[model samples]
Target: DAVHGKTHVFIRSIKNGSHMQEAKIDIKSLYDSLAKKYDVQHKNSYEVIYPKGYEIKVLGNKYVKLVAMSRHKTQKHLVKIVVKSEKTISLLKKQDEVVVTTLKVGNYVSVYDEASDKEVIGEIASIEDLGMTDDYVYDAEVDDDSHAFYASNILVH
Candidate 1:
């Protein structure tokens, strides 16, 4: 039980006030029901669990790692953003590769691998002004996926 053999206090937020509902619910039962609903909903989208202390990077200089994802609603467009890390850059530079200094939409960028100069023509898919922040999301379209890169990579082509 959620609060079986124990006391459960459920805090309820009220308009201009608050309330508490105390009870003992079967924790296993509640979890099972929620899991069932999530499985059904899983047909459309998936979910990830971010560990505690995880911070979403709206802007940074290290490298891009897609993490904490969020979206913004507007009358004209729905904007989405994600966290960034340095995994890709590290992987790319195993043989000491260079970073692109600057990037832009429709810009052609170079991509390579460990043992081959894999040539794949790519371009920036979409550029969205992220609210009032002095930041922009440069989503590069390579093949079928969009890779978001930081703006400091100024090796523009």
Candidate 2:
């Protein structure tokens, strides 16, 4: 019943990939099962917030909305965050938000966002592809460039 009403016999009769077991899975059921366990609300249901002072190195404050998101190759659901302030962005020609930090190929930049300011820690910071939605992966250094830094709007350490 996965094909709505087309059974295995019907699929085989049509000589489709399903006849060879290459297709014809109940994807709708699988999606439903995963949704119940993960609490994933698709794209529109989630709310993403950025702390006030996490300024992009090149993009500055105005380009906050241009932040990019990406999944790291190493971990599952692992995401990398990047952002460049206005000053740095001019010379780099990269996305305003979500700069490629040196966090390694599989690792991601760890970020802390709250009221006062934000903290970003990772391996290295590099600009691989460079663009919003296009860029945003933290490519860490091969060794342990593990970058740990804090950004505060208050001006105090």
Candidate number with greatest TM-score = 1
Q: What is the lDDT of residue 106 in candidate 1?
A: 56
Model 2, range 16-64, lDDT digits (tens) per residue?
3233212222223322332354343224422222222111211111112
Positional deviation of residue 97's Cα in model 2 after best superposition, in angstroms: 4.4
RMSD (Å) per prediction:
19.5, 21.3
lDDT of 1 by residue, 1-157 (tens): 0011111111111132344222222223322332344332221222222211211111222222223221111223222111121234435322112221113455554332213423233344444432322221112211112333211221121
The candidate that wins on lDDT is 1
